[model samples]
Target chain A: PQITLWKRPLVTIKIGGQLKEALLDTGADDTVIEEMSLPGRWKPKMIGGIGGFIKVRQYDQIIIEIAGHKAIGTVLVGPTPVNIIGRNLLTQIGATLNF
Target chain B: PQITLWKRPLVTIKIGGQLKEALLDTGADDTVIEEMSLPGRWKPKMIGGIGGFIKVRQYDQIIIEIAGHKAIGTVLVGPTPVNIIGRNLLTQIGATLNF
Candidate 1:
């Protein structure tokens, strides 16, 4: 899918059994989602935005399906205003920017 | 230009007379540049991020040349860690997300 910059590059994503819409964020280094319950052991981690580093939980081996493509990686659960599919997952799905 | 998610989608931009490298960020709703002295009148504005409502200065009718394309829009100046060319300017340059 080709998403124009006229709006947020929002897409339907399947995170295990939780179907959700997330933003394709070139500005973020990691994928972040709202705090939720998942089946796995998570470790404490920290990531930041344009500001300071915020503490989060890192869950490994999480399978996420973006649009139609999929990948398994460490997904961060934290206090993001919205769910974000950052470069970590974006690269997994072979997402790119074009002008 | 096509930018892969393997790295930051950084681009050379000419803002009036200042030439700098900035990130093409789909996650940012408004263009946010680092603190710089540009010839214009600006007003205080605030936008949301992972931190909070970041206070910034909004300069209107700022001419920016991005990736050999010309565009004019309101650009925010503030204490951003990195310069960002957000969706506001990306849309003007017909930037899109593809996978």
Candidate 2:
């Protein structure tokens, strides 16, 4: 399937049995979510952002659904400004960029 | 023409006679560069990122070349960790996302 890239390429993703709107962020190294209620054991890690780095919980082996395509990867949860689906999960769904 | 989406879809951009590598970021609303010195007047603006918002200089009517395609749009410059080619320039090049 193909989707047009608008001002923001937003998509609905299901993580931990909850639906969330996430940005398809190719610039980000990891997927970052705003909340921290996912069911899993997590490890604290630092991720670099626009201004600086932020501490986040890295939960491994989490299943996320992007447009019905199921993907298993690590999801970082913390006080992020946006819910971003980074390259880590994008590759799982075999997503590609075209121009 | 099309380009494969790598873990990070990086491309060469020619801005103000300077070449720089930038990540093709659909999550970002505007294009952002790490450094400033382009020939133009800029206005102060703020944009949201992974952790929080940051102040930047918004320069309008700047000519940017992405993948050899010319695009005229607004570009933001500041102390950024990564140079991002956002939706502002992506739309001009008719980019899309596919799975």
Candidate 3:
């Protein structure tokens, strides 16, 4: 799948038996989902952003279908402006940046 | 240029005749360069982020060479964790997300 940057590079992702749109963010190191509850044992973690950092729950080994590409990795749940799929998940899905 | 996700997708970009590394961020809406000096008329603006927002100086028509791709666009200068080349600049370079 090749997605142009004319608009926000958003893609449909299936996670936790639900579908949602998440941004493919190469700038971010880890996957971050907006405020949501996932049933599992998670650790309290903090992630930095453009302005400051935010406290989030880190859930590991979460299975996610990114644009039909299946993968499993850590997902950070927190209050975010948007859901971001970062390098962690992008690597699993063999996603890359091409010019 | 095809950039894999094995490591942070850092690229050398020439801006204002200076070379620096910046991340290719699809999640970010605007190009953000960490604190730097650009001679031009800029306006103060605030941008929202994962948790909050940051105050930035928006300088338009800044010419930059990203991965050897020439482009001119608006660049925001602020106190960020790192320099980020967002969708605005990414589009000019014909950058896209591929899987």
Candidate 4:
């Protein structure tokens, strides 16, 4: 046979009462959980970044799908305000983010 | 017996060849996978954000431990210059963020 098919699973996750459909990133290293959708109770600790980190911490749970495999894990609760995903959760799954 | 213990699992994940200690954020909305830790091989597609998404993707396999239960999940690829986590991973396991 020449080939078959290539596809990934998509999931619908709810954060802070907001439901969003995101493409499952199995290759990510850190779990950059969205802040807006996170609840207002599970906060994280403060850490330092390469240059200077911020003073904020939060945690939340969301839905996700893998290569026909679906499961849940811890996610950092916070706003992305950017175009990158953390590897905290991805690495745990034995996969890395790709672009 | 008057005995109580409350503690979380911690691990060392390598991102961009640099290792850092991160706490599992089960309350996160999305699995904001770290960008640097990625292996620069498994790149994903670009998607839309709240405002406007960017064109970037990457993936990698990392290790994690939660309450003595260790497992991994797929993560998004990109730079996180802020302090916010997503809820895409936690919801998969029927949980929510609180912070």
For all candidates in order, state the fraction of native interface contacts they contain: 0.81, 0.77, 0.91, 0.00
Q: Which candidate is the best by TM-score?
A: 3
Candidate 4, true inter-chain contacts retained? 0.00
Off by over 4 Å in 3: none
Model 1 alpha-carbon miss at residue B32, Å? 0.4
Q: lDDT of each structure?
A: 0.88, 0.85, 0.91, 0.39
Once model 2 is optimally superposed onto the true structure by TM-score, how far is the C-alpha of residue A61 displaced, in angstroms? 0.8
DockQ of each: 0.80, 0.71, 0.87, 0.04
Assess chain B of each prediction and give its TM-score. 0.94, 0.92, 0.95, 0.44
- The model with the greatest DockQ is 3
Tell me the docking grade of candidate 1: medium
Residue B83's lDDT within candidate 3 is: 93
Segments in model 4 whose C-alpha atoms lie over 4 Å from true places? A1-99, B1-29, B66-69, B83-85, B91-94, B97-99
Q: What's the C-alpha lDDT at position A23 in model 2? A: 87
Better of 2 and 4 by TM-score: 2
For candidate 4 chain A, the 10 contiguous residues with the lowest summed lDDT are A1-10
Candidate 3 vs candidate 4, TM-score winner: 3
- Tell me the TM-score of model 4: 0.31
Candidate that beats the other on DockQ, 3 or 4, i.e. the better one: 3
